[PDB]
Structure 1
């Protein structure tokens, strides 16, 4: 899906940006801030701010490019799906935005879709 790929492309563009608690871009990000930025930049409105809410909003996803992957219920971490088993995410303070295999989180996960 083209909107999904667009959200992914915006997330990828942020690879290398520093983590900051409270960051939603363009230069500094937390996990949910990267999700929010990536959607807003593509005109995909309606996305909430914090991870636990992003995990509950929208519709069920499949893990396709641009879906939101969330970790936990209630969720404490999120990323943007690449569509291949990996995600773009802002990991934690002291890391930069990067791609990680979703399996490497070693915890429960699901998918939402906002586009």
Structure 2
């Protein structure tokens, strides 16, 4: 899907940007801020601000490019699916935005779709 790929491309564009609690871009990100930025930049409105709400909004996803992957219920972490088992995410204070295999989180996860 083209909108999905667009959200992914915006997320990828932020690879290397520093983590900051409260960051939604363009230069500093928390996990849910990266998600929010990536959608907003593509005109995909309606995405909530924090991880726990992003996990509950939109519709069920499949893990295709641009879907939101969330971790836990209530969710404490999110990323943007690459569509290949990996995600773009803002990991934690002291890391930068990067790609990580979703399985490496070693915890419960699901997918939402906002496009």
Q: Structure 2 length normalisation: TM-score?
A: 1.00
CA distance in 2, matches of 1:33, 1:80: 11
Q: Structure 1 length normalisation: TM-score?
A: 1.00
Aligned-residue offset at 1:110: 0.0
Q: Deviations over 1:50-108 (max 9, x none)?
A: 00000000000000000000000000000000000000000000000000000000000
Aligned-residue offset at 1:19: 0.1
Residue of structure 2 in register with 1:90 after alignment: 90
- What secondary structure does 2:95 align onto? coil
Aligned-residue offset at 1:46: 0.0
CA distance in 1, matches of 2:103, 2:2: 25
**Runs of 4+ residues deviating >6 angstroms:** none
Q: CA RMSD in A?
A: 0.1
Say how many residue pairs are matched: 115
In the alignment, structure 2 segments of 5+ residues that lack a partner are none
Q: Deviations over 1:19-51 (max 9, x none)?
A: 000000000000000000000000000000000
- What secondary structure does 2:70 align onto? strand
